[PDB]
Amino acid sequence: SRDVYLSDLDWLNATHGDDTKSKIVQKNHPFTPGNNNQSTKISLKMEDGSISEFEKGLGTIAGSPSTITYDISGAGVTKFFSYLGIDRSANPINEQYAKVDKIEVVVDGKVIYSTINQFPNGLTYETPAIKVDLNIPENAKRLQLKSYAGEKTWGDEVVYADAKFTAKGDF
Ligand SMILES: CC(=O)N[C@H]1[C@@H](O[C@H]2[C@@H](O)[C@@H](CO)O[C@@H](O)[C@@H]2O[C@@H]2O[C@@H](C)[C@@H](O)[C@@H](O)[C@@H]2O)O[C@H](CO)[C@H](O)[C@@H]1O
Numbered sequence: 001s002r003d004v005y006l007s008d009l010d011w012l013n014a015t016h017g018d019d020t021k022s023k024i025v026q027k028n029h030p031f032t033p034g035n036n037n038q039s040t041k042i043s044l045k046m047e048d049g050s051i052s053e054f055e056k057g058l059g060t061i062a063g064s065p066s067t068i069t070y071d072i073s074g075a076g077v078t079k080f081f082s083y084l085g086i087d088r089s090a091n092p093i094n095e096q097y098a099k100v101d102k103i104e105v106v107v108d109g110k111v112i113y114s115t116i117n118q119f120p121n122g123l124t125y126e127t128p129a130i131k132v133d134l135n136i137p138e139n140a141k142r143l144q145l146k147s148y149a150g151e152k153t154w155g156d157e158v159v160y161a162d163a164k165f166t167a168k169g170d171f
């Protein structure tokens, strides 16, 4: 097997909760600064509270939900890894900002991982990153990363940091 960053693959579709649809989901930047063509790296508050920067990942704005879909048919994907969280670049100006109800990993229509199980009240700017290290079912065809904004999308700068598949085959 080998590891491949999701950001080094093309998605089938990528939808976000930002009002400006000309902005696009980002590879290897958080959503807002990346659409601004800044060099700002993805960064998250880690389990111990420290901030880590990442070279690789995906940057989106949560939506109802916002969905990134990959066609992983015949690829032999056996594992998915990512940190999940709200990028540090987000601005927690008040309690309505940077509040994400849940993030799911869905494979062929089945939720195989959800933050709701450990974080029933969702993610906030100061929730520590969540380490997702996940077996992927044999013969799977579609994988979707879904981030749910809840009441508003403000500040919902969701990053899939270090997001990568492990795969026995080719995409
Ligand atoms: C300053 C800040 O953190 N902005 C993020 C936030 O943006 C939206 C809110 O601030 C909202 C409050 O009513 O106003 C919206 O105008 C604003 O949208 C942002 O700014 C406008 C001018 C456009 O450029 C929009 O594309 C842009 O999103 O929440 C969004 C997600 O909805 C982003 O995280 C912003 O970084």
Ligand SMILES: [Ca+2]
Residues within 6 Å of the ligand: 062, 096, 097, 098, 099, 100, 101, 148, 149, 150, 151, 152, 153, 154, 156
């Ligand atoms: Ca929200």
